[PDB]
Amino acid sequence: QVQLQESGGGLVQPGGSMKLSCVASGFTFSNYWMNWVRQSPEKGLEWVAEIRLKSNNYATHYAESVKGRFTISRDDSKSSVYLQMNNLRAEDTGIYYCTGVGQFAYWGQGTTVTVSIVVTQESALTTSPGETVTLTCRSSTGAVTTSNYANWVQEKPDHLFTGLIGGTNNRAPGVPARFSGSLIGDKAALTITGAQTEDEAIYFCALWYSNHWVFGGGTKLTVLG
């Protein structure tokens, strides 16, 4: 059990500031880039920010939605990543997760912040135990390639995220072998070969475009029978 654990969220007014923290354990924190990703009341995931390694002088990149207002930082000696949020807006409301490793294997449980390119996935698919089901992930820019480093992430109740696949087809360790990533017909795809009842979940894909991630809107997989 690698563990990530976020803290610092709460109930804040527009205009305010707040700093989130996240403490990592179980992996060599300092060898990996770290990210913040947030889930809004709309259920969707939005990549917020990344921070690289000491050897990259800690280079950072931000979503356009938060550039100029948020600052990500890390303290390798404390295995911790941070997000300073300034000039908060109603649209900043959501659950904030710290996540990383090949490229989204690990997620914290998240910390709730309440302020008061299109990647397309199937809205829903229905399967049953023992079937083979394939979920797809399309880019508005054109064909998905290995240069998009497609990741697949599973959301179980309640806001429990685990990375399944990174780098198009690389299974995260401990991930069941029934899960596989591919490119099929210029889309990324995730296949469950022999669906199990416990695979009923929301599945998100994420595609990399040079220096940022864009998450798809997710696919609700129902496993019936």
Binding site: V101, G102, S147, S210
Partner: peptide
């Protein structure tokens, strides 16, 4: 291009 570190 992203964090491809194993």
């Amino acid at each position: 291009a992203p964090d491809t570190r194993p």
